[PDB]
Design a protein around this ligand. Structure first.
Ligand SMILES: CCCCCCCCCCCC(=O)O
Ligand SMILES: CCCCCCCCCCCC(=O)O
Lengths: 277, 252, 61, 178, 277, 61, 252
């Protein structure tokens, strides 16, 4: 089905046919194959590009964020999580998405929440299972300012209640973008006067995500770390582009430091001698 | 009479008047690589009669205290006519091989050899703490021999026969394509080995596809005035030899 | 039910290889990935020329 | 030249340069520093297995008056890298004649033992080397440069394919970006 | 279906038929049966070789590896696991696989992860359920150097997140080998000059496997032991060979010590008298 | 669904003995083992001779 | 445009953008020996792509005072890959050959070469009273050159161009398969030579089937600052190579 091209058996040649000669100036990539520049044998190639599919390539859960929130109200420790959803803080997944200019797809979101008890001299407890609450707040919705804010009522905002021990919570979401496709790159501004925000943040706005412990309080300080995972499915991509070369500096723009095109070597004719009997 | 048989490959012909049938690998007979199993896109070369012929290696002497011998192919044929030349100039190779071990005596001599072809005969080192050297695994048409006792060499192969240098029982080598040469009934042994490997083709210098072992289970013996010189000659002929990846000859 | 039998990906014992699927959710976004869509058209990037270029011929003439 | 356009430049000069190797490199689409970052190799780094042929297109950027013939050879694994033109000429080569047609393709056929090879190529899954030499030489008229640039292009054929999904080793971080 | 041969009823004999006489020199294994060398009765044999199938023989989860990793960063204890996948460190399964030269099959991998709390005078805790992460890194992928390395983002590498208490994690994998079949024995080298690596390690390269605790930290030192299990299915085997006689010494080669062919006994005619009224 | 009924292995109450199976995953590698493939051909190892040898006859003559 | 042409033999391919058609021997194209014309009863070997490929010889420099050059085949290819190996191991040989002489300059250079293939190019000695030595007739891929004046060597070939070392007129060499390389229009020359001999096959070391001569009739010239280095490379590829009489390699 997604099979690869076979190699036709070719023999000697001596004509005005010039498949090897061309002109890249046309912007046309040569469509030559081994059988065109040598004598080849017939080969029934059964290989398949099934795993090169944009679907199989991007459809794999990848971490996009991670924050920690405590249970007790001691010191200036955040007791809840806040996050302006986006996939530009994790270089791995961010680099893949940026292989294309525009994207369209549904998505499977999985959460890996783990807790712990902070070190201490006398910390003997017996706390029941910790239950967490993850609430999604689309742009404009009321934001909670405490682990007891009325906003956690989740009247209409989607929210998940998960208790430790059980399988990591998950749920799918459609294609939210108000545009016909998500934009990984936006060479424009937010204001017509050509100023303000520049790039991604200028238009993308998937809202925010908040988390917290629904448990009232813990005898001794404890903390939990939530890890968000994205897995696009039913994918569509447009306009491919040069992969990221320079390391990512900011998660709001494409700033970078002049990076080398590639690793170095002795000379253009350098090739390590691996045959030494 | 099925005792007599004749073999003809290229410009070579072998004769026998005391053979014991012919073992054909694992039921298969040598064949060229098919299109639905090939990988190398370049058109292979098939010298045919040029390389597919009988090559006789240095004879060996069977003595009352001989423990055995072994050869590794296609390496052992690196200097054999054009078959060896194609090994040098090509990156990939594929062949069949028809092993024919000769060894005659008389109705008054006695002994029994075990001619076997062991695919991927990975061998161990004398000093389990060290490694082995190619030089000790195979040395051209020159045969390496098994010892009736343990070896000590630094990077030598554990030649102790009972373990066949593989950490196994010699009595179980019968699970590989083989034949015996029971002097009282035999005179030689022939084995047609088909290309056996987990890949369509492979390098012929870097990889030793199979090892030919001749281990005597019945010690050579005889009375006085009875010819004491009993040689064992090995002849092998490649079959359906194909080559790919032509380039500058490899410097041994 | 609204079962839909498809073909599985070749196994390590080839040369009953089909699976069944039923969607339980009302939203298409709930369905599993489309790991079996094998469409291709490199022409967009490899041959985006206005005048068809025949391999066995000169690019310019 | 790791940060200049000279990194892509493959100079060729007029005058006797017989026996001189214009350039050379291994055939590691995803490991070789030369291909490691090209569109092709850049993608292979998201996979662990690869297979197929490769199209090495060479374009002469000299003047319209400069002429010459180069020998583009490819030697499969097994022997030492061609030290002379004769040794290189024994392998799969292409004699490129510079003319109206600026570019010339040197298709490196897939001549491997196994069906696939590791992007993280080792000696076992070696692919060979590619060496360029002067078939004749670069003759030029008076009042014309003596040094010319030759660009090299690399891409996969219709018989190419990747297979083992993995993470690329060309991107990482030490903490969440902000 | 996989039934065994029945025994035909045989009677007296006196002919030139010599089924008992043969010549092993031919390399042919005698196909004689009881009815050929004596008078036998008809017997409808219903026995079946259904459990002798290479499938039923090798298709059974067998441990292939085991390592321990701690939670706290105290002393020089490894907080994560690393492993160059292979089945040559566990003699049991290794010996079976080595009954054949080449193998081809898919595989079911199961993980048995267990934790514990190291001894101490004052170790009163209350740690929530421990969540683990197993990540497979195919040859070439970036390797993590800490329990907080970016590599654990699992952008495209397959990874599993499991919490203690639940059933041991499992997942199937196809036929990875770049060859047409896995090779248990390789009488060759890695370099053309006939040197470097010799044997298995010369060509096999299934990549590496890493594990760790996703939990930030534990009050007191704790450790976990992961056990990897392999269960080949959809099996295919070629070229059978003599079972391992000498004990396994190294997991990289076939080195061995001259071992006895078998146990000893008084004499060739020794047979214990078990009948003593 | 794409159900496939097969025969079960004899029980301890012999002399409805069939089971049903449906593959849920897209990859053949996900399917259960093939514990019911009973093929045989010892000839490869027991009789790999070029000339058929009849039991009731002399191996050599 | 018939100017551009491509040649493909084995794993080798030649390109041209300024050729002048292709001369095909005496109207014939290389072909294997037929059964009704064969003599050697043994089955011949046909390496095909292994030996039938483009072999490039040592380049030569064309100077304003160059008188010419010449090569003798198949001798000149005695050390070329497998084609040379078959010459050593076989008593009889037969091949076609596709001569391709390259030589580029510029629209500002001028000169005209004469690429010719002379069958049985028996040559004379410098000293008419003595004989010639094989060493002076052909020396591997190393080309012998013609001199604008008389030679004196003991057993040297009368290199004086005007007589082409054959006692004839150079202007009449056009009666042999040939082409010219007029720099103002050309860039190379190709000639497909069919097996020409009074015998089905012949030894390849003892007999020099044909001689390739490159004699310039229009002296190379140019102005100042114009590339003074104008090399002339010769590439040849055997066609329908057959071999008979396999035996121990011949010691050169
Ligand atoms: C209920 C949780 C909703 C989370 C919305 C995530 C949307 C991700 C969009 C990614 C856009 C992009 O990568 O260009
Ligand atoms: C996702 C985990 C991947 C693990 C790959 C294991 C492959 C095992 C191959 C065994 C090869 C052999 O036994 O010869």
């Amino acid at each position: 089905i997604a099979r690869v091209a076979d190699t036709v058996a070719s023999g000697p040649s001596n004509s005005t046919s010039i498949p090897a000669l061309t002109a890249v100036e046309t912007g046309h990539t040569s469509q030559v194959e081994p059988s065109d520049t040598m004598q080849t044998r017939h080969v029934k190639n059964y290989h398949s590009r099934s795993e090169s599919t944009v679907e199989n390539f991007l459809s794999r859960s990848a971490c996009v964020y991670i924050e920690e929130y405590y249970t007790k109200d001691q010191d200036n420790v955040n007791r809840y999580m806040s996050w302006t959803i986006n996939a530009r803080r994790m270089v791995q997944l961010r680099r893949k998405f940026e292989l294309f200019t525009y994207m369209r797809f549904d998505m499977e979101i999985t959460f890996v929440i783990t807790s712990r008890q902070l070190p201490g001299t006398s910390i003997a407890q017996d706390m029941p299972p910790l239950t967490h609450q993850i609430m999604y707040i689309p742009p404009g919705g009321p934001v909670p300012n405490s682990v007891t804010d009325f906003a956690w009522q989740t009247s209409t905002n989607p929210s998940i209640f998960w208790t430790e021990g059980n399988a990591p919570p998950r749920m799918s979401i459609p294609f939210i973008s108000i545009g016909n496709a998500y934009s990984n790159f936006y060479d424009g501004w937010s204001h017509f006067s050509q100023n303000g925000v520049y790039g991604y943040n200028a238009l993308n706005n998937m809202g925010k995500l908040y988390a917290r412990h629904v448990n009232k309080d813990t005898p001794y300080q404890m903390s939990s770390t939530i890890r968000v995972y994205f897995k696009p499915k039913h994918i569509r991509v447009w306009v491919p582009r040069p992969p990221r070369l320079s390391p990512y500096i900011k998660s709001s723009n494409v700033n970078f430091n002049p990076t080398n095109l590639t690793d170095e070597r002795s000379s253009i004719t350098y090739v390590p001698d691996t045959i030494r009997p | 009479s099925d005792r007599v048989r004749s073999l003809t490959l290229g410009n070579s012909t072998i004769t026998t008047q005391e053979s014991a049938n012919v073992v054909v690998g694992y039921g298969r007979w040598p064949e060229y690589l098919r299109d639905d199993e090939a990988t190398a896109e370049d058109q292979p070369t098939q010298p045919d009669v040029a390389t597919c012929r009988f090559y006789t290696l240095e004879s060996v002497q069977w003595e009352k205290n001989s423990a055995g011998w072994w050869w590794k192919f296609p390496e052992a044929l690196k200097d054999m006519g054009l078959f060896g030349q194609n090994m040098l100039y090509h990156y990939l190779g594929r062949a069949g091989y028809t092993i024919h071990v000769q060894c005659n005596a008389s109705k008054f001599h006695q002994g029994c050899l075990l001619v076997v072809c062991v695919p991927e005969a990975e061998m161990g080192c004398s000093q389990t703490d060290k490694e082995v050297a190619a030089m000790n695994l195979t040395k051209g048409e020159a045969a390496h021999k098994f010892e009736p006792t343990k070896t000590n060499g630094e990077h030598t192969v554990q030649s102790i026969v009972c373990n066949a240098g593989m950490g196994v029982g010699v009595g179980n080598l019968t699970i590989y394509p083989h034949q015996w040469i029971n002097l009282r009934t035999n005179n030689c042994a022939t084995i047609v080995m088909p290309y056996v490997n987990s890949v369509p083709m492979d390098n012929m210098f870097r990889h030793y596809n199979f090892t030919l072992m001749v281990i005597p289970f019945a010690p050579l013996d005889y009375a006085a005035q009875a010819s004491e010189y009993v040689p064992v000659t090995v002849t092998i002929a490649p079959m359906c030899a194909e080559y790919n990846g032509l380039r500058l000859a490899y410097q041994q | 039910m609204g079962a839909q039998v498809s073909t599985q990906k070749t196994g390590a014992h080839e040369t009953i290889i089909h699976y069944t699927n039923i969607n339980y959710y009302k939203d298409a976004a709930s369905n599993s990935a489309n790991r079996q869509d094998f469409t291709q058209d490199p022409g967009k990037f490899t041959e985006p020329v206005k005048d068809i270029m025949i391999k066995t011929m000169p690019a310019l003439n | 030249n790791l940060q200049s356009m000279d990194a892509y430049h493959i100079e060729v000069n007029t005058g006797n340069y017989q026996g001189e190797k214009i350039f050379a490199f291994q055939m590691q689409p995803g490991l070789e520093s030369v291909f490691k970052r090209t569109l092709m190799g850049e993608i292979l780094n998201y996979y662990a297995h690869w297979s197929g042929s490769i199209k090495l297109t060479f374009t002469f950027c000299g003047s319209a008056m400069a002429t010459g013939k180069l020998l583009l050879a490819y030697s499969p694994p097994g022997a030492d890298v061609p030290a002379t033109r004769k040794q290189a000429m024994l392998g799969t080569h292409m004699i490129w004649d510079i003319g109206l047609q600026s570019s010339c393709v040197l298709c490196i056929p897939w001549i491997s033992q196994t069906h696939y090879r590791l992007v993280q190529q080792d000696e076992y899954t070696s692919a060979g080397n590619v060496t360029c030499w002067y078939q004749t030489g670069i003759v030029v008229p008076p009042g014309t440069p003596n040094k010319c640039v030759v660009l090299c292009f690399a891409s996969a054929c219709n018989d190419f394919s990747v297979r083992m999904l993995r993470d690329t080793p060309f991107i990482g971080q030490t903490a969440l970006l902000q």
